[PDB]
Write a protein that binds this ligand. Structure first.
Ligand SMILES: Nc1ccc(CNC(=O)Nc2ccc(S(=O)(=O)c3ccccc3)cc2)cn1
Ligand SMILES: Nc1ccc(CNC(=O)Nc2ccc(S(=O)(=O)c3ccccc3)cc2)cn1
Lengths: 471, 473
């Protein structure tokens, strides 16, 4: 069972003896710190953490004794605030006397703005605020995935619109392939759900259960997929029977969309000779609602995609759309699901546009690039203390390393507001109390063990929409 | 609760309709596929996966119905193999008819060798082999962390030995700071435990319980830490009271080691004026078993470390060790825990060496670089089918993309052997049965729902030792 007393950085166990004596309050905030591009971020993932790890009775006699035993060996010393945790158990029935206020999930906020604040509600629990920093900071991941996924959506929207004249099916242009490529099962579900903020296609099943349990959607499921082959279902037929493999698979899935990896031995042979001649008759008869999706999986992503399109373009009836770009027949599409990150995605669609190929023809699958190749310093997700009350006096506190002005933190009590021009601004030093900037955008989402405000995955998707989608 | 039927890539749900008819066997393997660095990998993490996810009754009536309902909406169609999973439930009481053979955990194996193999033990469950691919491929992470952590230990060993003459305290030279920097709680435990294969210092507590539960050690805990400050325990005192903060903290932890982050406002001022002058009397009186550890946390890592060292060098009695390198007094040490990955680590220790500073003086803390900034691409961890039996005929299968020879996979039944020179070699096409390379070094670790072989964390650590560590005496 999960023990909150064992879910923090080791050194934080000793922090209760380090704060100034007579401190009744520690007030801390979280931000995606600005750097001297990712200029805006999707806030998402906190609600998962609040429900799974923070709410309800999270402190028991056993969990205190368990932590006491581990830390005694871990530090080779008795440093442990047993009295502090005992107080929470006896006074609040193990509920955390903590208040968390946050911007609504799905909200797109520019860098350098307060996203959520944390403070203690009982003077005795001044130390508790930063105890849970570690677990709260891990919200960097769904934030970063949601943000990076959305930035890829912008690129896709831009080129799809320019080459086709609309945004039909945009929410299916980036498919999640990252299940095997992430660090754990929990990460898989969290990352997949963050991608589903922007798109509807995934193969990381674990994301669906997470969303249903912690967020919920009106639709039965927030994510979908199509039948598809892997290298094993092709190669098992033997080197000389790749055509037999292809034919068997498209026949088994003739009434639904089907993706078939075609690079097992020779991708260019498979497209031109096998799909393009030998099995062409099984392709041109397929429904528009059930196309074949050819899937390359090796070589230079841009060069391979272009050559595949070039090959298919001469074996299948190609039309030219109203924008002047070439379009494959509705029964034939391509997915590039290898080597795809935000960088190569940009290079590929730009490369396609150069060769007069519409983005209608292609979709992208991304695994490690989508869910794993991301870190905390990408958006500079940081948790810092900005306000304390010592001896009854409030103090505006901050860090400001001389050798790195970028790591400077904000001072005092914070609030997030709309600017007159409709942008965002974070007010420091409690200046939000002057009420010159309208209502604080931060809402109490957690207080004293209870989740006080929630959001459905539907609301979140609404909030995180692209401007071009709104227009 | 965990549902193994819902713990695979979506398209694998449709794969049982795609294999050649009358296929009774699917046999697959796992390798860190070959391509100058990371030439050998530490195999670790599979035992965790086997116990937490694969062993015992992992199939129930409810889990089948649950998966059925999800996939129906997920695919907008009914492609779920309900009959297949029912067979497993009815015939084997939910236990997976799978055999897994694997190299011992902790073992150090060169790239391009078979690390583990998977095959179905029931002809009916031919589809089961690659269903669990996704869940097994995730072992890439503890493999990659342990490997990357060990490569850093090599760097540390080299420079510590050269600057000091020995390797005393090497296992504490790289500390885990990555709890907040990973993608989840589970990842935190898995990653931290992987680091602990090579070192003993961690702040990621979640690693301890994982090891105790799934691996075990003779000692009460596999990892240790020391009292330390964060910026909040310094800045809360106020801008003009950094000295008071320092003094309070070192006094509270006067008889134990204590790390104190010193860059809140001015790292160079804190080292020279506050530590080096104002509170000097509180530092030189400290025990050798309870030193102050000064912690910079900003600026260019190499430049900052050298400057901090030069500053302390002129404020404290520095000695020169037997190798001719400068050494801080035993009550004073430094940890650099910002911007540390395998590349910057190398740059720092080399820079220290050129300035005649011993690696005895310093230790490193690493967070995102140690536990998060890693992918499956790094060691090319890959799972591939190499052998099937269809119509009673065994077929050696493989992929070999025309545009990427590096993605070529191995053929047929695999086995791992010792060469006459004592190296590793992977034999393909069932050639291991020729008995020219002796016995298969793989062990059956999982069979029919039961873990058949396992390793304590102590033995895993022993297996993962460095050659330089083994050279004794
Ligand atoms: N890890 C993994 C998982 C799975 C795979 C292989 N599956 C795979 O490619 N599926 C796939 C393909 C295409 C599209 S689509 O383009 O959105 C599309 C959808 C419907 C109709 C037309 C087009 C969606 C899904 C590889 N690796
Ligand atoms: N995420 C996190 C966690 C924690 C921190 C700050 N804690 C921290 O630096 N601890 C620390 C310091 C030094 C050493 S040591 O050098 O191995 C050492 C050990 C004993 C005696 C002498 C020397 C080990 C641990 C930052 N970030």
């Amino acid at each position: 069972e999960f023990n909150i007393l064992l879910a923090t950085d080791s050194y934080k166990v000793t922090h209760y003896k380090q704060y100034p004596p007579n401190t009744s309050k520690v007030y801390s905030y979280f931000e995606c710190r600005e750097k001297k591009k990712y200029e805006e971020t999707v806030f998402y993932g906190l609600q998962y953490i609040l429900n799974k790890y923070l709410k309800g009775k999270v402190v028991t006699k056993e969990k205190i004794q368990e932590a006491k035993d581990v830390y005694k060996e871990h530090f080779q010393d008795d440093v442990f605030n047993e009295k502090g945790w005992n107080y929470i158990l006896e006074k609040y029935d193990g509920h955390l006397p903590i208040e968390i206020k946050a911007v609504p999930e799905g909200f797109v906020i520019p860098r350098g703005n307060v996203l959520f604040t944390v403070e203690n509600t009982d003077p005795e629990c001044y130390w508790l605020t930063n105890w849970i920093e570690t677990i709260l900071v891990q919200s960097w991941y769904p934030i970063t995935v949601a943000t990076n996924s959305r930035e890829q959506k912008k690129i896709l929207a831009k080129y799809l619109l320019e080459t086709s004249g609309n945004l039909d099916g945009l929410e299916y242009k980036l498919h999640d392939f990252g299940y095997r490529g992430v660090s754990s099962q929990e990460t898989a579900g969290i990352g997949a759900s963050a991608h589903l903020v922007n798109f509807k296609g995934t193969d990381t099943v674990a994301g669906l259960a997470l969303i249903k349990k912690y967020y919920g959607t009106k639709d039965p499921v927030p994510g979908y997929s199509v039948p598809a082959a892997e290298h094993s279902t092709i190669t098992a037929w033997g080197k000389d029977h790749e055509k037999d493999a292809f034919e068997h698979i498209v026949t088994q899935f003739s009434s639904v969309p089907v993706s078939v990896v075609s690079d097992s031995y020779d991708i260019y042979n498979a497209c031109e000779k096998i799909w393009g001649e030998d099995l062409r008759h099984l392709i041109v008869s397929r429904s528009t609602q059930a196309p074949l999706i050819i899937r390359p999986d090796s070589g230079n992503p841009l060069d391979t995609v272009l050559k595949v399109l070039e090959i298919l373009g001469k074996k299948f009836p190609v039309t030219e759309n109203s924008k002047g770009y070439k379009l494959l027949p509705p029964y034939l599409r391509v997915i590039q699901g290898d080597g795809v990150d935000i960088n190569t995605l940009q290079e590929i669609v730009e490369g396609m546009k150069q060769k007069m190929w519409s983005i209608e023809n292609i979709a992208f699958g991304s695994g490690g690039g989508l869910l794993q190749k991301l870190t905390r310093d990408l958006l500079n997700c940081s948790f810092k203390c900005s306000y304390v009350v010592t001896n009854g006096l409030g103090i505006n506190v901050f860090k400001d390393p001389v050798a790195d002005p970028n790591k400077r933190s904000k001072k005092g009590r914070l609030s997030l507001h709309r600017t007159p021009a409709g942008n965002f601004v974070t007010l420091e030093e409690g200046k939000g109390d002057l009420e010159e900037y309208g209502q604080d955008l931060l809402h109490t989402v957690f207080k004293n063990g209870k989740v006080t405000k929630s959001y459905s995955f539907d609301e979140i998707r609404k909030n995180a929409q692209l401007n071009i989608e709104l227009e």
